[PDB]
């Protein structure tokens, strides 16, 4: 054929892939973690949003740390050969590097490691997206008023950490905000931007719109001076090697 | 005059010193931190225990992070010249390196820095004791069934010298509190101070506390994750002398 370009992930496999949504609302009493009112709004929005993008969505509610790890391990051992991508959404309490099971913490690194390029071969070279609504610490943002190269090697390898994207709801070190009536600022903005732009913008550009929406349209209201009038900026952590479009042809 | 030894801190100043007890029981709703039932039992036991050791005890309840820092700053700026030692007791939520104010976290390093040898001169060379009942993480212990080349031109000490941290639990672990009896650590500490402050050096008292907590307590929970767990306190000593609460 004629000239070809390879700057975008191949997204025309028979299936878009799995969208695993882990929705932790109610936590074991002994942990002392509060119920996350509004998270069902998030989970329902995500299910519908990713259903419209043709993902096979699986919702899981109130999983223990043991169940989270088992679920991720089992999903990573499925055959993803006919799937374009993998999406995992985590809705829970958290701190930097950690997501809360209902009975205690899970290392994010433990979860994502199952999907490493060398450990999940049917996802090697495919985009692996982790969307995380959880705190990353306890900071609050007060805001501000506005021949050739020497070596080709003898083996074509890619890094095992390549082709991951972490779409974090908030900056490193900071709380993340969730409204008990409307759902979280981040997830509600994400779904809105995916619905408006998934058929026309590359994913990083969609997430940039999400960044702007969260940054400009939300601000906390609290009777507690410590928590009042606070702002949030999400953080895109991209180790992708290609552009990602949810459409094709 | 006869042979002398100085292996022990001078504890016969006119005053033993301050004992500052910060008792955080109720936390701002927005933090999501649970109320610490049983902590008043700890606070009352400590007040009495250190009163009997002749400390000037000050109890403070439900302090914000801002109030904790300002309290420590102010206390560190007092004149401690007539005082033998300094004691601070922290009762709160926490994680590794952190104690919870009622509205959010305080770095333990920020608190203790006020009392550095170079920043609180009237406590230089004197023992500074920080007793901490708080979690240090979320791990649970399942237990197991049973001449010289250089003298230098100015003698200095390290600014981090003469601190002791008596932690309720090992690094990385939860600390346990009973809602009706008080915390395992504080109740054991007070009991051992009551029994042994007039005859054992402080490290040996704290070792008895370690044994008591390790052997006599075990959690009971309807939740399998939290049931039948154990605790070992951790003594972190940067003291340079033996510490006896009695003298003469």
């Amino acid at each position: 054929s004629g000239i070809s370009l390879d700057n975008s992930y191949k997204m025309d496999y028979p299936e878009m892939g799995l969208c695993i949504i882990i929705n932790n609302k109610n936590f074991h009493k002994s942990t002392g973690m509060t119920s996350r009112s509004g998270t069902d709004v998030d989970a329902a929005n995500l299910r519908e949003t990713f259903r419209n993008l043709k993902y096979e969505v699986r919702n899981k509610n109130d999983l223990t740390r043991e169940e989270i790890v088992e679920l991720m391990r089992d999903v990573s051992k499925e055959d993803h050969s006919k799937r374009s991508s993998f999406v995992c959404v985590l809705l829970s309490h958290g701190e930097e590097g950690i997501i809360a099971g209902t009975n205690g913490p899970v290392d994010l690194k433990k979860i994502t490691n199952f999907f490493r390029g060398d450990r999940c071969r049917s996802l090697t070279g495919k985009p692996k997206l982790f969307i995380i609504q959880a705190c990353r610490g306890t900071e609050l943002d007060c805001g501000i008023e506005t021949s050739g190269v020497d070596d080709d090697m003898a083996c074509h390898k890619i890094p095992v950490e390549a082709d991951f994207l972490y779409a974090y709801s908030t900056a490193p070190g900071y709380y993340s905000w969730r409204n008990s009536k409307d759902g979280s600022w981040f997830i509600q903005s994400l779904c809105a931007m995916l619905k408006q732009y998934a058929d026309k913008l590359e994913f990083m550009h969609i997430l940039t719109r999400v960044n702007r929406k969260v940054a400009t349209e939300f601000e906390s209201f609290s009777f507690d001076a410590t928590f009042h009038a606070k702002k949030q900026i999400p953080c895109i952590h991209s180790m992708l090697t290609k552009e990602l479009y949810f459409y094709h042809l | 005059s006869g042979i002398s030894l100085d292996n022990s801190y001078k504890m016969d100043y006119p005053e033993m010193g301050l004992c500052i007890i910060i008792n955080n029981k109720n936390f701002h709703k927005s933090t999501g931190m649970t109320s610490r039932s049983g902590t008043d039992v700890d606070a009352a036991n400590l007040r009495e225990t250190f009163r009997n050791l002749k400390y000037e005890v000050r109890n403070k309840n439900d302090l914000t992070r801002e109030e904790i820092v300002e309290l420590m700053r102010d206390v560190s700026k007092e004149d401690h010249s007539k005082r033998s030692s300094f004691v601070c007791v922290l009762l709160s939520h926490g994680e590794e390196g952190i104690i919870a104010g009622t509205n959010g976290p305080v770095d333990l390093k920020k608190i203790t820095n006020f009392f550095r040898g170079d920043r609180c001169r009237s406590l230089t060379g004197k023992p500074k004791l920080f007793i901490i009942q708080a979690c240090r993480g979320t791990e649970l212990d399942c237990g197991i069934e049973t001449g010289v080349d250089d003298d230098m031109a100015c003698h200095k000490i390290p600014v981090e010298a003469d601190f002791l941290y008596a932690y309720s639990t090992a690094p990385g672990y939860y600390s346990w509190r009973n809602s009706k009896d008080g915390s395992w650590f504080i109740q054991s500490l007070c009991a051992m101070l009551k029994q042994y402050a007039d005859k054992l050096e402080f490290m040996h008292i704290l070792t008895r506390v370690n044994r008591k907590v390790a052997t006599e307590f075990e959690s009971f929970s309807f939740d399998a994750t939290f049931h039948a767990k154990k605790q070992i306190p951790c003594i972190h000593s940067m003291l340079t002398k033996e510490l006896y609460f009695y003298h003469l």
């Binding site: 996350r36 959880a134 709801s169 905000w177 969730r178 928590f227 | -």
Partner: peptide
């Protein structure tokens, strides 16, 4: 508004 609540924090996670």
């Amino acid at each position: 508004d609540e924090v996670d």
